[PDB]
Amino acid sequence: MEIFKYMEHQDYEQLVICQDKASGLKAIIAIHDTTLGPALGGTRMWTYASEEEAIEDALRLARGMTYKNAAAGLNLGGGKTVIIGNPKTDKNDEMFRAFGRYIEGLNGRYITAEDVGTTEADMDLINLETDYVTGTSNPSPVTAYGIYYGMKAAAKEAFGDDSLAGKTVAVQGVGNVAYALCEYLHEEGAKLIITDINEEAVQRAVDAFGATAVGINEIYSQEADIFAPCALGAIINDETIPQLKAKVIAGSANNQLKETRHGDLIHEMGIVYAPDYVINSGGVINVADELDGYNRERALKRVEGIYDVIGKIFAISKRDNIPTYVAADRMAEERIARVANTRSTFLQNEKSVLSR
Amino acid sequence: MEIFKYMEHQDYEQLVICQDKASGLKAIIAIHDTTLGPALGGTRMWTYASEEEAIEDALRLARGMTYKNAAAGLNLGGGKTVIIGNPKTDKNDEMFRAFGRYIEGLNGRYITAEDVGTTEADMDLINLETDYVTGTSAGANPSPVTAYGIYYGMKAAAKEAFGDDSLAGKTVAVQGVGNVAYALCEYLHEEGAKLIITDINEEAVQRAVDAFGATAVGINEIYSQEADIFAPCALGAIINDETIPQLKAKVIAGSANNQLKETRHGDLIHEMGIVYAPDYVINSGGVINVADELDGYNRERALKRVEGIYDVIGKIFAISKRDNIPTYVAADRMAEERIARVANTRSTFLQNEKSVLSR
Amino acid sequence: MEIFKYMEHQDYEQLVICQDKASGLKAIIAIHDTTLGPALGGTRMWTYASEEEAIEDALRLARGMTYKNAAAGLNLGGGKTVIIGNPKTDKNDEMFRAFGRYIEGLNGRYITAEDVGTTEADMDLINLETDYVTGTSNPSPVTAYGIYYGMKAAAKEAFGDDSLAGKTVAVQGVGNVAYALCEYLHEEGAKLIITDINEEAVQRAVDAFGATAVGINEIYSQEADIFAPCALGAIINDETIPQLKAKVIAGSANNQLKETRHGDLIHEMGIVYAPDYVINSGGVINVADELDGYNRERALKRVEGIYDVIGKIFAISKRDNIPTYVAADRMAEERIARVANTRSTFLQNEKSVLSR
Amino acid sequence: MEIFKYMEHQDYEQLVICQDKASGLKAIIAIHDTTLGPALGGTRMWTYASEEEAIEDALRLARGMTYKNAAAGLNLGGGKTVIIGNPKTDKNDEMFRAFGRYIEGLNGRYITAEDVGTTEADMDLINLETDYVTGTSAGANPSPVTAYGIYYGMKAAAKEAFGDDSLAGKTVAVQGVGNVAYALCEYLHEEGAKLIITDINEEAVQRAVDAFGATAVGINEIYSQEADIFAPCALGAIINDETIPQLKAKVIAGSANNQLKETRHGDLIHEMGIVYAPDYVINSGGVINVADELDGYNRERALKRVEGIYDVIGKIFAISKRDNIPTYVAADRMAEERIARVANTRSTFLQNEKSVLSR
């Protein structure tokens, strides 16, 4: 690929390709933007059909973080690390120690964490060589508590009232996070229409929340006020758009829109869409709270702030008259700009997530 | 190209690609080996026909620096920075500032300096964002230091080809009369040696003949002349099939890089019994000099330190006939062995190891 | 002796002979290797028939630590201190303060702890002059919890299943550690065949775990799946090899093999042997956890990692086809090598057990 | 040998034995006493017939240094390093680097320098791993400093043997015309004194006669000559039964170590009324000079500081006739008493005591 062309087009800061023959390590640390502070983002360990495919994927995810972190109201930039290899086989201690030294050598310009392929055990190895890492020492309820309020924000929007008590939610998927979100939607008093490929899990829920099991492909039109995509992505497409009976789409899943088009138009139908990478922010917020001494309680409390940011998102659409998925991208760019401006006044030692 | 495949082959540590849209900065920092310490190598700013072409050039160059720095007896690893752009038009304050920030970012793993298309004015801008740079206008006229460097290396060349260090009298043919070339002459004339030069610049050749009472000769009549020492000090590859034949100068010791055009040529001169001071080692007084700025620059100390090139060249001759191999191969083997030897020695535990960065 | 010849033969780093006339102190700090970090190892206080006998013993134990610590996955080198004297008589405060100053003068190249002869009270005196000490401020259950999992690792090896529940264990000796190991082997549901010279202790166990007392010399052939040598060493010899009915040998005792031969051959019989100095690692691991602020819980959790290392040991044998006691020595050398290589990349301030 | 028994007798603090297989480093660092402060003593690199033989030599030497440093009025304890190996063949970069690491390890308890078989080039390698070393090429021509040291000590010798410090005129017989010897002559000639020399090297003796208008004499005709001052500046034991008889020079003040071959000889010259400036104290300007590098080297300050040897020698004469004992015994008693006196004085509590290591 044309690395420099790709980078220049969106002004990527760095591409730090790291290598260690003996441990077989091959990592690609992409740093898109560091305006708001150190670039933070997890390291994905997967197999890639080509070198420069992993490169582009690393760059693409880095740029995704600068937006997510920005919108989440965090003081962190956008980075991401891709480690070429099969997480299930070719993993070893030295490989992560090596990666850790290299992170130590970027002296805080990058901060890592887990992502698909890497685990809390890997982060511990890294932490042996550097402090610029998170996801060490369950994170599910936290991000779960995040969708909860984001959904609240969707409610007051679509039902002029953030109270979900009473309403029915069509929950697609019942994994740890989806499961947790249910508990919240439950103890507040609401009906759930769970589903999932794993029968066994559809149990735990029905039994615990008195929920009704429904056909995996029937979950799209159920008699519910809100639809919570918490399974795979792209579930919001041409097939599902019509079906949808719910007034709101608020879920934990990534890449909820198969095409931009899908977004452009659900916005026509007057469906209330809480942009995916923002509503599920609770996840990154939570790992950032470790940088200043992890504290579940505070973490759980800050995640609750997605309510406002989601609101800010609706406020942007009702301004440039653009769909929420577009209001998100714009809200981050605006914050990054506003903060950069505010912090241009001289100081001998400004603060940052790294300041003790 | 397959970067990861190229890096793993010779085990390159990192390739830090830095970009800045607003200033048009396209920088490739290649870190080959940091075993002896931070990677030090200048930044070559030039125009490249292809992206992968500059990345290949940076990697190849970084690994070159890890052999030089190591052979030179310095405690620095191998790195190099390649900036793609036309040095005569594209330069602008911001691009170097940006560069310096990223270097600050590598927190001491990489240290920069001058190179093709780069200047100390360039080094001063970088210095506004980081200390990890050398060859600033406040630190390191260097030409004479490196010149005093080959001078001693050449003396080391003798006592091997003449059994004596006394270049006193003996004739030396010098290709090119540039800054370094000129200073090399000064040291030679002084010890009372016969100098025969050449160089495209008539005035340069002129100032030389008058200054040292030289014997000006033609661009081509330099490879061949009646002198017991050949000092190629202009361009490389000057030791090829067209020049090897008509030389017969017991010694070769110059300031030019890549003197041998092919590994074969070295394999030959070796057989022909010509003592050759491997180029990148005899002319290391250049990197040694910039290295001296890290611990507070002192020219007088750089000069006395560059004298060490003598003891080192002679060490290569020792290795040359230890495994009986041409001097260009003994050079590379010595470098490799000092790294492993030093790495071994420093594996003993300490709480605050010393580095060229220690205050 | 030929100190230098002995040291050069195995590349010992230092022999720091320390002396203080008034307090009568005579200590010998041996530091074998510090590649993985500071040399850590306890100080043994005993009476020696000769100076240079204590010297060799100090050197031998130091080299033993570099292997134990290495295999334990710790970032510590190998050292050891021998104090010539009768622990029961000639002990005094100044003597340990003096030793402490000298340790302070090696500035972290050596870290000490208790060993036979020295106590938690001695470590406190040392700690008065330096921070490079551990075993200050019960350690038994911790190392006990270590054999537990190591034994688990032996199980899955010999019975294709790490679950010990059901199986019977022939426990030789019933001291604090052996006693603790029993509790684990008990609450998981297994039968125990305890024994020991101290009748009184054979009680506590039988009563608490419903175990059967057996003749001290009968403990070697009992109808049990696993044999846990937790008494003295060399219990695995020509006499005991045959007798052995158990499929596995996993215990807390040191020097479990009287001769190398014994090992070479039990490996023939297909007996599963968890190398002694590795399975009982829980002990040193535990004291190392003080260096970063002691925490019993974490300690107890890290000790649980002996399961993997023991496994790695079996994996080495099934590779060079060598007995476990040999697979151990080789696994440490390999780790020391691999780590040394990984950490050769320059950094202005790499981490170490001493970094705050 | 019984190391622990030897150490306890004179209460030695430590014996740090360091080894490195790859470089063949066999180092014995003996720390005798660190009461006045870090132990300072150079490393003697030599070949020894037996291991216990070198360990004995290091211990004996370290305790020597704790008397010298103390008598010299310096704030340093006694140490010494003995490296076993042939200085002419066995040296190699790695062994010294390794040495320096271990010294860094002793964190300031031991400070090294030059000695038999060691050089400042050696000291520069060590300096790459630690600051706890002196006599580097960047710090401490020393010969004249120590020479200016005995010069003042000799002046102190007078005013005791002649009631006056004015060596002006008086004759001095100098055994040996080495670097230090030569500089001792310069100070003497200058104050207008008569110089009579000798030394195996005819040219050295020659440069001396012409330079100072000396009076060259034979190797054996130096112990005996018509001079009121004998300056043994070559080898020791030069004050024995074969030379004591035919001397009659009111004073003895030289640069040579172990001037008395036996304690008896000192007991005699004392009785014979010859004023003797105890060797290791008059020639301490050597250790004083290297000591001055710790607080940022300054030759001019070392020189004015070495002048203190005068005030100290005269202090020995005071003790000499305070307990009425030969000057060689008063020297050892003064050293011992300054340590106890200083130790007592510094027992008062402070949060950050001053040391030669303070910045």
Place this chain on the structure above:
Amino acid sequence: MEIFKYMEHQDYEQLVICQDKASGLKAIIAIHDTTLGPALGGTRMWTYASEEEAIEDALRLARGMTYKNAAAGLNLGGGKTVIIGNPKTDKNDEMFRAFGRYIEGLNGRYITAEDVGTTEADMDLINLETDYVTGTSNPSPVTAYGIYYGMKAAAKEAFGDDSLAGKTVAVQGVGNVAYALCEYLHEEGAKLIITDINEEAVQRAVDAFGATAVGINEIYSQEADIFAPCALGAIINDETIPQLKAKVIAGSANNQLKETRHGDLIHEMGIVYAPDYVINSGGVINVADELDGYNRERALKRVEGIYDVIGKIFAISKRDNIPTYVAADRMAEERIARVANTRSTFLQNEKSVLSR
């Protein structure tokens, strides 16, 4: 007085006379010895009939601390501060702030605390200007727990057994400390014969411990194994010596001997006397534990060490054949000497109660 003559005679280090006109402060900080470390000792605020009377008293108490602290096994020297004034009237904030600055100016050579006249409230004011102070942020049980073990040490001495359970103790005085000591002597199972000028307090005890009230002057001969002087001092004199039926004298009171003679002779009668300033050490030990972050538990545990030191005291008498009150003075001088010697080896940064 002849200040310098007084100081030189016992080698006093300093006499720091501090003054502040406005706040009316007049303090005299005496520092006898700092060999073992910073001089620690409380500040006594009282009215003095003459300047140089307060001076001598300050010097005398300083020298007393160097002995108490020494014998207590602490790493503290001997100092003391006397503030001329009536604690009940002429006290004010500035006065103690001023004193505090001056202590800050001795940079750790002196550390203060409360003594008669000064309170925990005064220490707080001082602490506003310096960290070199203790007795800030009940101390009674702690020092009470100190006499307890000291008495234990007296028991094993006089009754060949440190167990006091059973024995009867004649407790003179029933203040906070005496009261606490009782609880210990009680829960271990022993009979008490309390007394005191304050009837009301003789109650609390009798009622709580089932003790027998006795005549204030009858407390000296009661049928008891041990006599615990916990009231005023000099209670051990010509009148009381004979009377004494108890085999041991162990109490909290200061200056328990009216004359040296009294000591010289009770040692004849074979009475076991636990030197006062040592057995009641628990008090200073406790305040020293604040210097490293106060912790009641540890404090209470270290105080328990008086058992050994008291023992060491008996061991000295049985050596030079001198009474305990003399064995004390000698044990401190010996420790100060031994420690000074041990710590003469060079170190760039030795430890001290002030090191973090």
